[PDB]
């Protein structure tokens, strides 16, 4: 997955938060890091805090 | 008896002279409050070391043989192999240990220090306010003499053991508290602040329920968390000084931290701001409680004996003083005006500058801009064929913080321009294109998507020319975007862009997505459908109904940024809810007991719920499955009682813990007796992974 097709490069219209959300809920690492996600704000706005631990290594973990 | 000198402590003519300064700042002062706070310090860094500074994931982070881009603030400085890493975290939870039991306390803290810079300085991407506060306390008490009390050392050698230290050990870290609640405050008066934009969604929580039976959450979003906030800042700043104010401001500085710490996520910082807080009480506060107890419980406490003298002060009668009591001032004064300066040196290093201030750790601006990034390209040109091709967004990284900051961006094009031709690729050209927004404004570009990042110019002392000015004159629309975002239904969605000059924006639309429409906010566009090459002039207020399923182009062909919005819905997502809700209708009559009739076959494995014997189930049917699997997970979850949670909890501590230390002694064989065989530490690592139970 190093390249990307030329067709799917450009799409701006591609949902980040929502795809993002379904991946978390669906990787066996989040479940319960998406029903948080997904009940609380985005995790775009969590990425956009800053300040928080570790939030992707929590996620992946 | 001056009530200036009773208030502050001190009398003018202390500061008459030099040698009277000195005196003042290193006058006898009782140890008690600084050892309290050095074992409180050295356990929650125990804590901490395990958990945030990445010892547990440290074997998939410095992999060896795995090629990823590292962000370090030298270029010069390069990783260790992993076992090597390890050993470094090991110094470092020694050290912590060291402190905390005031056992070799000048070593303990120097290893503690060393290895902790390092690791802050080896990835840029892992800079946080309160670790850089971590590093400034060790640093700060590497000098301090807090193994006077309740210390091991005291009763390894008698003559440290209850005396008294100087005046500036409580002075340096009072000073910092104080920097830091000011510069939050005071960085805290930005219009994205006062005005409720950054952190608007913090007023719907449970614990701000009691709040809203007086005031609406749109009042509560901005005179409680905001305006609470700021003047919460500049109060625990300055009451705790004081000795009038010390109760009040310690309920409120406590109750903020408590709030603070089970609204977030930030980890040790709210405890050890706790920890912090009774430094400002009198420096005698534990040996006076601790008095105010039965016999048996002072036998094992620490001494309530008053304290014995001391050498490293000057005790007035003359006694001259010597250099280490020079020193202490000069470090005091010299350290308290770096402090005060740094967060402001961001007009002498403005290589690192962008819509924001300087890199992100040291300026204690917490949770003031909030980012929502749309979309990053990147494309690269094959220096030998003319070849044009495309990059997945962030590959051959761990981190996102590279879209926001040039440097690194720098950086990541060195990386992988070096990396590249592993894959067939000659010398490369990488151009970026990213669309970020800052606190709900338009989506913008925040670099140039014309210029090769790999033979861009930057240094750290000189403005970048490739980093796109942020359009403050679009701020005011930020009103007008929220309403209408506020008009549409479940499934329309809404983006908003900002485009400058000259440059063009090309999109594919995917083919699920039907029924997406272009409108015009500001200025004037062209619209290019590339199928038959037909372009349209478009004004204010007109709308277009594009293709789905084919490639546009937008066009800025005015004096000033154009702003437009892209409005869609997904007709498949759509088509499918329709589809399941007519399904379910269907199932919920067959169970009421209408449809007499037979149950059609594909509906068979829905009321069974188990395909056995029979046909394989349509898609359809599959997904109506995994929605009600997944909802009575959500259901069995959401129901769930407080003690299952807390001793999950626990346990996962537990296993946290327990992998870090079985990772590092496997570490440390190796390192130390060689490599034992292969399957050997296959099994090793099984064992070391698996669950407690
Ligand atoms: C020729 C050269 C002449 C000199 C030029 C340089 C002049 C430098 C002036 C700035 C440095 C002054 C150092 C003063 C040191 C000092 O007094 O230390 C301390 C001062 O306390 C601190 O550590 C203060 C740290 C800063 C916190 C913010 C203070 C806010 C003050 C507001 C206005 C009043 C004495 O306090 P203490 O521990 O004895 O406690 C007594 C007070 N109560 C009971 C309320 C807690
Ligand atoms: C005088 C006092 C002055 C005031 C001092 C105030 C400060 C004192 C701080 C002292 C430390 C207190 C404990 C801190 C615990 C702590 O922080 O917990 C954690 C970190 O600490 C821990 O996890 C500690 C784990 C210890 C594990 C000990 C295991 C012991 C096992 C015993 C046997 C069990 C047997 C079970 C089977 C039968 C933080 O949680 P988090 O970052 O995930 O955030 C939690 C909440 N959310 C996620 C919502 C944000
Ligand atoms: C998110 C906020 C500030 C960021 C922050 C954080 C996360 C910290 O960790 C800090 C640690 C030390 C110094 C500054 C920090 C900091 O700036 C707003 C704060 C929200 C909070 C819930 C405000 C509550 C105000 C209380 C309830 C008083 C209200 C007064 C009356 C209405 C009762
Ligand atoms: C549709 O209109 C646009 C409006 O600019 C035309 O575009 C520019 O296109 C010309 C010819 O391809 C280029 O030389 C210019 O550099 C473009 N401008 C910019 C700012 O990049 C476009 O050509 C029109 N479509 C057709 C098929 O003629
Ligand atoms: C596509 O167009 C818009 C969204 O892009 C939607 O149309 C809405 O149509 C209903 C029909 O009664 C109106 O009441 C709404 O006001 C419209 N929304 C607007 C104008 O923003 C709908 O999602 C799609 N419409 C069609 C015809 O496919
Ligand atoms: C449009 O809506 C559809 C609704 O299904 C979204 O799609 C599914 O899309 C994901 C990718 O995120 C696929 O893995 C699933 O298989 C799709 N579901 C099916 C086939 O039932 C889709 O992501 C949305 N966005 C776009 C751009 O189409
Ligand atoms: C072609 O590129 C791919 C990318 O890994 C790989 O097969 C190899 O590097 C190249 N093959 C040849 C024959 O050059």
Redesign the pocket.
Known sequence: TVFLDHENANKILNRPKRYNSGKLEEFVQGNLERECMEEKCSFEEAREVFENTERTTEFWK | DSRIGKLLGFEWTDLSSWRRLVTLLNRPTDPASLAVFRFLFGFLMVLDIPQERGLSSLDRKYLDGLDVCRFPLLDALRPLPLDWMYLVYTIMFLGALGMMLGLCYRISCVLFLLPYWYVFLLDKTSWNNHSYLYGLLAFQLTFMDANHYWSVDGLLNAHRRNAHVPLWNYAVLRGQIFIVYFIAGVKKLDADWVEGYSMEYLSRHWLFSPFKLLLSEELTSLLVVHWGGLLLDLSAGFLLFFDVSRSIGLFFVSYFHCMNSQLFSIGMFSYVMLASSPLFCSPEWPRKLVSYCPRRLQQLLPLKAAPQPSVSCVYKRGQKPGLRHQLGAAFTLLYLLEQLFLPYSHFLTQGYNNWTNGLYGYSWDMMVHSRSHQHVKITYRDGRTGELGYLNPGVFTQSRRWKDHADMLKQYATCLSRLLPKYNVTEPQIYFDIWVSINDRFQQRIFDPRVDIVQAAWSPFQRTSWVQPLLMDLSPWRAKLQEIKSSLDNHTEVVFIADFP?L?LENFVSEDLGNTSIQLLQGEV?V?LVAE?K?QTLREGEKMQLPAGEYHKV?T?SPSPSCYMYVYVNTTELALEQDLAYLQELKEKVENGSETGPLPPELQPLLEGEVKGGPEPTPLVQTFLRRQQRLQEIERRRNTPFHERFFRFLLRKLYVFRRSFLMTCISLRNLILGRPSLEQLAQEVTYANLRPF
Do not use: K, L
Request: hydrophobic share 0%; no cysteine; charged share 10%.
């Open positions: 000259g063009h062209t290019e090459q372009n066009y062909t």
